[PDB]
Amino acid sequence: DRKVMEYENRIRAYSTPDKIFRYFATLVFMTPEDFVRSITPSIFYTLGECGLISFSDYIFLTTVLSTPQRNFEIAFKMFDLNGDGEVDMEEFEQVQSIIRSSALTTYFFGADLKGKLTIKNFLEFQRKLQHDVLKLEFERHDPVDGRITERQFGGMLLAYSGVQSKKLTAMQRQLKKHFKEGKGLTFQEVENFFTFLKNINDVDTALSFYHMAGASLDKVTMQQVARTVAKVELSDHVCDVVFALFDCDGNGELSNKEFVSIMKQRLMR
Amino acid sequence: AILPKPVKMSFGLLRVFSIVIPFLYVGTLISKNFAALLEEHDIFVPE
């Protein structure tokens, strides 16, 4: 049943989100499990049933999954009308009618329709939601005691990149033969590395600084920028996997259009 | 009576060989060139 698989891939990779909504809904409403099937080729008990009424909670949680931190804070800026630093569910309803033109609204703002919301709660909301999604993606591939294989991590990277490359697919299926031994990839390596991949537009600054001079990307520079802008630690095994997977011409070091331009273009659309 | 001589041509073996071998080299050259040309893009299939 690979035809339904690849057809859902073609829908989820490029279509408008309303067609994705009417395609992955049964009730018109989604369950959170309908949302998980929409986003994949416990906060479920908190999301409830009153969710994704007119495919606009879909857009909002997509935004939560796809927003760097300074962009997240200025999204909190553009929520707050009067600028008091708080956003109740009432101000979010006022923004939300403009977006369109409730269980999470009762859950995260206030049960008694009373939202007194700091920046820190909104940050916790992002971290819980994205970390639960990242844990689900880490555990779909059945890690060998918290250690996924090299082709599994390469498949996660290619699923995040969203570009139907067959050169990189051949490199992915060669990865097990390139690194003849694989110790595995821990969840903290995956966590730090997708934390780094979340913020590439911010990472793009010193990269273009380096790049319009020259396209020669080593791993110590990437680890310095990762520990700079995200305070994350990239183990050199992850760097070996990335260099073995994405260096197509095999010159040792990456250019923009090999990795970074494609990841940036994924961050655009 | 008996038919005339079966006519031959002006060094047929040599010219057949001299036209089959360089075009064989042009064929293997353009095969390598096409292999590289769509190895550059993602249209190739060696695995």
Swiss-Prot record, chain A:
Changing R12E: Impaired interaction with MCU. One of its GO terms (cellular component) is mitochondrial crista junction. The modification Phosphoserine is found at S15. Changing R22P: In MPXPS; uncertain significance. Residues 67-101, 234-269 form the EF-hand domain. Changing Y14A: Decreased ability to inhibit MCU channel activity in absence of calcium. GO terms for molecular function: calcium channel inhibitor activity; calcium channel regulator activity; calcium ion binding; calcium ion sensor activity; identical protein binding; protein heterodimerization activity. Changing R10A: Slightly decreased ability to inhibit MCU channel activity in absence of calcium. Phosphorylation at Ser-15 by AKT1 impairs its maturation and stability. Changing Y7A: Decreased ability to inhibit MCU channel activity in absence of calcium. Activated by spermine, kaempferol and SB202190, which bind MICU1 and prevent MCU pore occlusion in absence of calcium. Changing E91 to A/K: Abolishes mitochondrial Ca(2+) uptake. Changing D247A: Abolishes mitochondrial Ca(2+) uptake. Changing E258A: Abolishes mitochondrial Ca(2+) uptake. The keyword Metal-binding applies. Changing E258K: Loss of function. Changing K19E: Abolished ability to inhibit MCU in absence of calcium. Heterodimer; disulfide-linked; heterodimerizes with MICU2 or MICU3. Homodimer; disulfide-linked. Component of the uniplex complex, composed of MCU, EMRE/SMDT1, MICU1 and MICU2 (or MICU3) in a 4:4:1:1 stoichiometry. The composition of calcium sensors within the uniplex complex can differ depending on tissues: a MICU1 homodimer can be present instead of the MICU1-MICU2 heterodimer in skeletal-muscle and kidney. MICU1 is recruited to the uniplex complex by EMRE/SMDT1, and it associates with MCU at low calcium levels, occluding the pore of the MCU channel. Associates with the MICOS complex. This is Calcium uptake protein 1, mitochondrial. The gene is MICU1.
From Swiss-Prot, chain B:
Undergoes proteolytic degradation in neurons: degraded by AFG3L2 and SPG7 before SMDT1/EMRE assembly with the uniporter complex, limiting the availability of SMDT1/EMRE for MCU assembly and promoting efficient assembly of gatekeeper subunits with MCU. Changing S31W: Abolishes calcium uptake into mitochondria. Promotes association with MCU, protecting SMDT1/EMRE from degradation by AFG3L2 and SP7. Changing L29W: Promotes association with MCU, protecting SMDT1/EMRE from degradation by AFG3L2 and SP7. Changing P6 to A/W: Abolished interaction with MCU. It is found in: Mitochondrion inner membrane. The chain crosses the membrane at residues 12-31. A motif (GXXXX[G/A/S]) lies at residues 27-31. Residues 32-47 are mitochondrial intermembrane. Residues 1-11 are mitochondrial matrix. Essential regulatory subunit of the mitochondrial calcium uniporter complex (uniplex), a complex that mediates calcium uptake into mitochondria. Required to bridge the calcium-sensing proteins MICU1 with the calcium-conducting subunit MCU. Acts by mediating activation of MCU and retention of MICU1 to the MCU pore, in order to ensure tight regulation of the uniplex complex and appropriate responses to intracellular calcium signaling. Belongs to the SMDT1/EMRE family. The GXXXX[G/A/S] motif at the C-terminal part of the transmembrane region mediates interaction with MCU and is required to activate the calcium-conducting pore in the uniporter complex. The poly-Asp region at the C-terminus mediates interaction with the polybasic region of MICU1. Component of the uniplex complex, composed of MCU, EMRE/SMDT1, MICU1 and MICU2 (or MICU3) in a 4:4:1:1 stoichiometry. The number of EMRE/SMDT1 molecules is hovewer variable, ranging from 1 to 4 copies per uniplex complex, leading to uniplex complexes with distinct gatekeeping profiles. Interacts (via its C-terminal poly-Asp tail) with MCUR1; the interaction is direct. Unprocessed form interacts (via transit peptide) with MAIP1. This is Essential MCU regulator, mitochondrial. The gene is SMDT1. The chain holds residues 55 to 101 of 107 of the full protein.
